[PDB]
Amino acid sequence: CEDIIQWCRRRLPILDWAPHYNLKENLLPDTVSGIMLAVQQVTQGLAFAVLSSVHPVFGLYGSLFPAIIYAIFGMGHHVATGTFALTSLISANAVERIVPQNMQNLTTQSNTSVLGLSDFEMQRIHVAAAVSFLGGVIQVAMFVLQLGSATFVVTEPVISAMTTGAATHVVTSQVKYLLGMKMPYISGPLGFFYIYAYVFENIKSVRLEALLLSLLSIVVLVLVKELNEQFKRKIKVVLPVDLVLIIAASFACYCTNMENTYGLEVVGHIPQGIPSPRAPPMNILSAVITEAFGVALVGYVASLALAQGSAKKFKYSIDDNQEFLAHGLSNIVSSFFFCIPSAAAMGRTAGLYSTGAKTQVACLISCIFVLIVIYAIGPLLYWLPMCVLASIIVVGLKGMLIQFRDLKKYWNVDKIDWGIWVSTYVFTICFAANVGLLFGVVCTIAIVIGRFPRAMTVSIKNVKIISINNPLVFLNAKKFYTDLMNMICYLILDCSGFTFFDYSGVSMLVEVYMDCKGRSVDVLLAHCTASLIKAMTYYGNLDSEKPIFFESVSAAISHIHS
Amino acid sequence: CEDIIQWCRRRLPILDWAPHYNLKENLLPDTVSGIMLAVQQVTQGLAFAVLSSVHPVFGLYGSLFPAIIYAIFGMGHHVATGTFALTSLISANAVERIVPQNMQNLTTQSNTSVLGLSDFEMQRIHVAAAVSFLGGVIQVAMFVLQLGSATFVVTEPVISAMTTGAATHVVTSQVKYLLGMKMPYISGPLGFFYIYAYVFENIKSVRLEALLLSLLSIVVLVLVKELNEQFKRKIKVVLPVDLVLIIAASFACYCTNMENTYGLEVVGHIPQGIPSPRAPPMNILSAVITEAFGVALVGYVASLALAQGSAKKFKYSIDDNQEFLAHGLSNIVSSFFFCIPSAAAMGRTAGLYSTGAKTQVACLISCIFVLIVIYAIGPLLYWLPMCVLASIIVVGLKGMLIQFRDLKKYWNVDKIDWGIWVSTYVFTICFAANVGLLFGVVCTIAIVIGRFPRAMTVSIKNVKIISINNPLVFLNAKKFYTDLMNMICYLILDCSGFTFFDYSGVSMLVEVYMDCKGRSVDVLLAHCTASLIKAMTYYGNLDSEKPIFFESVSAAISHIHS
Ligand SMILES: [I-]
Ligand SMILES: [I-]
Ligand SMILES: [I-]
Ligand SMILES: [I-]
């Protein structure tokens, strides 16, 4: 049928922009954006595969396949799917719990040892792929039963606080690389403070060379990135400072013995790869349920925020339910190619904004470059120090960390969203990002619920006319009663603003009617829609041959003159 | 201070009705109600202490102390605290899990064997007392932080469905006594069907004498109780059919060997009691957390419903937070006297209505009679068959079971509360009463939340005037936008019905203003309270020297004429 064809065409938004592509003004900016995004995605993939307690080579795969799937199935134009450290910090818990460090040695190194990797490295990527697969199927299920229409519960302050707290957590997790020391996997309901306790207790074990390298890299990156923004009118491009820093650090670590003399840590091997696809270990799909739910929700909300921001900024329309399908398909297809959970990072979107990308082609061209890294520039990334990579990551987290300035706006506007922001931030700092999101949503719903029984439900208009403003539900059913008995020969209830109700509202309206009848004051109603009339005539046994319901306030006023 | 004194006086409502008592028209009906309630409380205490997997003598204690404490600390007039089978069915789970049947034999019978009971009987009453104590402290804590104001979330259909399902469960639990067979403790997420599966698989083990006795008792009870109400005008009293049935059954079981010849089951010993108070075992207070929460919530909700019904019927005012304190104190004080969890049953309230009780004195006089049962009529309750007791209980459950007629009203009024009723009933039948209550509350909140983004948010009134009906929160912030852009030189937003908002509402209002400015249509506002003006001027950078906010619609109309 025609409707079936329309439905099928609505699930592939690429056909909306592929034939309409213009190679006269949407090619050069898209190409430049792709080149500038390739290095960002490569560095983020490496640093967030190390953050996910898997081999760094798998973050490179995480920057290739989900981007293609989202380009085919995604609605947002400036959304670049990838590694997204927020989900890596969640999958690391499952990876470290199922496969702890005590099985590091005495391995096989053969018997389906994919790539050139040793054993105990496939045991961890298998758990990560299982987490990705379960998160993808959860997202697809949430697409089937249309929960994308229920995304209004996640408000702006909750997402802002959760992302700021997660940025602080990611900054904390990179501290050991900037300092140069080694720490065990510390996680839990208060790991943020335990990490710094460990750092301060072992302050004599830090390496000065790593500290100076990280400080120099951070200073140079911040200086170049802040000087380029202010001089945008003169310099009409974006300076690739990250690429220059990576090349300089690698060349300085190679034309020395800085891996041996001044004991440093570098990115290990990165073998040339893309092996044959393999199904994830469905045996583990029962022990990673909570991590799968956490990634499937956190990644979706963080990516939907970016998609909605892009749609608002560039004046186009997106669907909150198509993002569910796009992200679920990305995760499911990626889990077969040894990929960690994927989502959209705000830094890549900000880079796309600053470069001038137009369509999803900029997110595809970068993939073409990532392939080149897999097969050609793979072994070349041996001498990049982890201090420089950590400096790059913490400088790129600036957009997420700068969201502390929303506190002034929330204080000057609401002062109730200010408290929600602060509570969500402290919960995200203490426990985690998913706990922070859940707490924020629950707190928002509870606050909005506890504000109906303490708000004015009627308005007196200048026989007296009383207009019913808000809908009459169980939330403000009793408050309505005491609102109407407090404002007491005739009475007109203008029900034009009375849209929807329930059993409690109808029962309370009938109770008000009978109580006013008992106190020798008549109650004439108004528009009252058409279902309200039926409900009130059934509940109150109201006879149809008595004038109670009128078509307008003027009709009731005319009925008074009789 | 005077406020402290008034606060302390508000916590003892007995002083509100003790000195104002009138022993002219509030004594004879109160005395008759007390006499007619004593036998009801005795039978329910016995049959609900057996239902709680403890000795039947402890249900007699459960009908004595919480009644006194609620009389001192309670607001409702026709509320009689006691055993309340709904809470017994919850505490039985803890009793049977902590102390299962396999240690019934090989006991000590000494070393602080209270009263004359064997051991393994104190082991169960200790667990029940711990459950009641923890529930009481939970209720007192819920009184401290004033959660009694947040009781509007529990609606009438949820309570009705939960009570009907629990009544069906209680009818199921008494089936073995009516039939005469014996069953092991069956409970779980589908125990209601497993009980009947056991009954049908062992249909050859039922006792005919017990079945005929139960059928005769049920028929006589129903006949007398339905003939008495319909001849209320002639018979100006309530016939004590339960007392006559108990005496007749006991006397016909004594002047025969019906405990031996036609093998029956009778009430065991009922020793003369009221022992010394003893603190409940605090070692167990960690294994009964869920049962304590279940009783503390179900009992409070089912008793608050009755208190509110009484207040509405007899035109007085109660406090939803004082009931928390009264019930918590009742449970805590009763836990020291070997009592099972306590609450208010609907049958006792219906009996109080039908007798003519006026104050809480009718709930105290019965206590005086219960004392007589403890010390004098204790051993006399040996030959009462369990078939007659089960018949009495299932006939008394008529008020709870008749609530199926609310389905017609809910169908003819709402059709959305009808679905909530049905869903809560089926969940209560499947799992339990507490699960049913939780599901009902969550379903009500979810349905009410889902109904905001699909309701009309504005109303055009006959330049064009558009009145803002509902509050602008995150629930209907987006729906408002598309509601106002769809209805599009001048535009007036009558903000009289606009009462409370949040960040999302203010941001959406400012977005509508800017978009209308871009489309060359001016937006003039209205009353707009006083904080809305500040929020809109801050968020939108609105200058105070431009006419945007007016005091009334007529002022805006006058501004047009310029
Ligand atoms: I990120
Ligand atoms: I996190
Ligand atoms: I009951
Ligand atoms: I139950």
Side-chain angles (χ1 to χ4, degrees), chain A residues 409 412 417 451 501 503 538, chain B residues 409 412 451 501 503 538:
Chain A
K409 167 184 60 183
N412 284 123
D417 286 25
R451 275 223 278 181
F501 50 85
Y503 173 74
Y538 182 85
Chain B
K409 169 181 60 184
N412 288 136
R451 271 222 273 176
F501 47 80
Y503 177 72
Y538 184 87

Side-chain angles (χ1 to χ4, degrees), chain A residues 171-227:
Chain A
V171 164
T172 301
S173 83
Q174 307 280 314
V175 160
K176 50 160 164 183
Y177 294 111
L178 308 159
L179 293 184
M181 65 183 270
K182 291 169 214 334
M183 314 183 15
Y185 171 76
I186 300 173
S187 159
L190 272 182
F192 169 81
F193 306 95
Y194 295 148
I195 286 180
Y196 283 104
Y198 190 91
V199 160
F200 291 150
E201 281 170 14
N202 307 115
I203 208 63
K204 311 184 73 69
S205 176
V206 306
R207 318 215 50 84
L208 284 189
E209 293 93 2
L211 189 56
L212 308 165
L213 258 293
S214 67
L215 274 197
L216 190 37
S217 303
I218 282 172
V219 164
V220 160
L221 277 177
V222 162
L223 183 71
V224 172
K225 279 187 175 180
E226 298 287 270
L227 278 196

